[PDB]
Amino acid sequence: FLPFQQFGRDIADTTDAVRDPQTLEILDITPCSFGGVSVITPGTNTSNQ
Amino acid sequence: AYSNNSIAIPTNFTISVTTEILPVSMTKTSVDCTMYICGDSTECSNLLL
């Protein structure tokens, strides 16, 4: 990052990066891990696995 | 040429190979409604329900 750039956002207008307000350090904002929960299960009358 | 007593019959041939490119399937995509509004916030979920 250039010395004068404070934060930045991605194409979705969500903030992907930030500069340390105390010391001089540059940190990216990476959202917490996610994905979809896929359930592989037989019918309710078969089992609960 | 067009005549009643005239006919044309081929004396030789050739074997031609052509190409037609036909699509079968597209990319499977699934978009979440809540994460498309925002994540890690209950304001998007209460106002979205």
> How close does chain B come to A16, measured CA to CA in Å?
14
Beta bridge partners of A27: A18
Q: Which two tokens stand for residue A14?
A: 């969500």
Contact A32 B40 (CB under 8 A): yes
Neighbours of B29 (CB within 10 A): 5
Resolution in A: 2.8
Contact B39 A36 (CB under 8 A): no
In angstroms, the Cα distances linking A31 to A5, A7, A10, A17 are 21, 15, 12, 11
Amino acid sitting at position A46: T
For this PDB entry, the determination method is cryo-EM
> How close does chain A come to B37, measured CA to CA in Å?
11
